[PDB]
Structure 1
């Protein structure tokens, strides 16, 4: 009900796909859950041109990859190729980002713009991601990240209300 899905956005595999309350799918989004399921958290803002593709078929005899996930208050930036990443709640994904195979994003993370998280890259909680090759830039503040996520959730709710159908 509360989830504002855009008209230009596409959600392939509706049974596999999953959208929590107060969600926001921007225009030209692609939540392709044909092969596997895609779980979106509450108050999660998926920005425009975001390719939400399923990680694996989940039909492998041994060591099948985890399909998709997204914690609450997840600020997914525009043009972000989210694939096979278990995003912890309050994860701030950067613009033009790229998630790897079975990448574990921790709580209160801050992915930089134009980043590339590699396969099986376990990011630590309260830490800014940086570099061309994934690495720890520095420890992030708890109060500043929570305030920015609250402001982003309020702004997305206003755009969710009007001008989309």
Structure 2
């Protein structure tokens, strides 16, 4: 849809990836969509050179690590690591970050750059997280969250066709 397919789009079994409207399909990343699911949504903005892959598909007898969980209109940065997380919608992600073990972020929850979290992490709605361990930077403003969502979709659709062959 809105995500203009990049010229160098490559991934390893990316069967779970949505054609998000008003987005920007970035290259240099990876996606293990054939393994499990991922909650993709329209109006988002994902950067390049990312590290995306589903954690598991609840590989234990009960319920192990789920696929993923994410939202729409989120502001995703670059070089982040996604593993055992549960993100929300219109969230401003951090650059070169890493998803904590059993992480859970609600909608518009801001993320710090190069930040991670410990085992069994959680985050509230429009709550800024931080630290190498599970830490909270603060809270994100809802007005700034919707503004970042709209500006992210705008800049995504703007720079989406940049040599996206």
Aligned length: 165
Distance in 2 of aligned mates of 1:127 and 1:16: 27
Distance in 2 of aligned mates of 1:95 and 1:140: 17
Structure 1 residue 131: Cα displacement: 2.0
Of 128-137 and 66-75, more deviation after overlay is shown by 128-137
Structure 1 residue 155: Cα displacement: 1.0
Structure 1 residue 160: Cα displacement: 1.4
Structure 1 residue 98: Cα displacement: 0.5
Structure 1 residue 87: Cα displacement: 1.3
Of 18-27 and 101-110, more deviation after overlay is shown by 18-27
Kept in 1, the 8 Å contact 2:44–2:73? The answer is yes
Kept in 1, the 8 Å contact 2:15–2:32? The answer is no
Structure 1 residue 69: Cα displacement: 2.5
Distance in 1 of aligned mates of 2:101 and 2:135: 16
User: Given the two structures, how large is their TM-score scaled by the length of structure 1?
Assistant: 0.88
Structure 1 residue 102: Cα displacement: 2.7
User: Given the two structures, how large is their TM-score scaled by the length of structure 2?
Assistant: 0.88
Gaps spanning 5+ residues in structure 1: where?
Answer: none
Distance in 2 of aligned mates of 1:101 and 1:130: 14
More strand by share: 1
Larger RCO (alpha carbons 8 Å, 6+ apart): 2
Of 65-74 and 141-150, more deviation after overlay is shown by 141-150
SS where residue 129 of structure 2 aligns? strand
Distance in 2 of aligned mates of 1:88 and 1:143: 16
Distance in 2 of aligned mates of 1:141 and 1:57: 34
Structure 1 residue 27: Cα displacement: 2.2
* Cα distance, 1:88–1:31 mapped onto 2, change above 3 Å: same
Kept in 1, the 8 Å contact 2:41–2:72? The answer is yes
RMSD: 1.9
Distance in 2 of aligned mates of 1:64 and 1:18: 24
State the match for 2:5 in structure 1: 5
